[PDB]
Structures are given as C-alpha cells and as structure tokens.
Amino acid sequence: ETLCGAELVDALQFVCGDRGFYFNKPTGYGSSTGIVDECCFRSCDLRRLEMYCAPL
Ligand SMILES: C[C@H](CCC(=O)N(CCCNC(=O)[C@H](O)[C@@H](O)[C@H](O)[C@H](O)CO)CCCNC(=O)[C@H](O)[C@@H](O)[C@H](O)[C@H](O)CO)[C@H]1CC[C@H]2[C@@H]3CC[C@@H]4C[C@H](O)CC[C@]4(C)[C@H]3C[C@H](O)[C@]12C
Ligand SMILES: [Br-]
8 A cells, every 4th residue: 555646645745734745855965766766656654754744
C-alpha cells in the first residue's frame, strides 16, 4: 500500500498542516531522490513522510 498522486498530496496536506511540503528536500548551500521514490514507488511510514514537510 503506497501513496501516489492525489492520495499523496492529501496525506501531505494533512500531516504537514499549514507548514507546506516539498517533493524533494532542498540541499542548501555548502552541503556535503524524493517523496515519489520513497512513498509512491515504494511504501514509506509516517515518520519518513513527515520529513517532507517544510519548516515552521
Ligand atoms: C487519509 C489521511 C489524510 C487526510 C484525508 O484523507 N482526508 C481529510 C480528513 C479530515 N479532513 C478535514 O478535517 C478537512 O478540513 C475536510 O473534512 C473538509 O470537509 C474539506 O477540507 C472542505 O474542502 C480526506 C476526507 C475525504 N473527504 C470526504 O469524504 C468529503 O469531503 C466528506 O467529509 C464531505 O465533506 C461531508 O460528508 C459533507 O457533510 C492520510 C494522512 C497520513 C496517511 C498515512 C501515512 C502513513 C502510511 C502510508 C502508507 O503508504 C499507507 C498507510 C498510512 C497509515 C497512510 C494512510 C492514510 O493515507 C493517511 C492516514
Ligand atoms: Br519540491
């Protein structure tokens, strides 16, 4: 059981609330896949899903 398309967006809107979400985690400067790969093509748990919520 995975989350794809609208189901995936519904889950993110519910879990992230008003924070917003991204499909790929930004890399940021001086740093040393995405949610579709982790949660739609593959099954992911709530903890991993919430990691795609933007910051407060
Ligand atoms: C279904 C959950 C999201 C929310 C959701 O999915 N809905 C909204 C629920 C409550 N919503 C609100 O509080 C809103 O304000 C609405 O009620 C409000 O009415 C509208 O915003 C107005 O635009 C879906 C609700 C479906 N909607 C309806 O049925 C109708 O809108 C209905 O209620 C009529 O409005 C009403 O009859 C009129 O009188 C998502 C969030 C996280 C997800 C789990 C993540 C971890 C695991 C991943 C696996 O790969 C699969 C397993 C899983 C356990 C996932 C399961 C599931 O995928 C979850 C529980
Ligand atoms: Br993104």
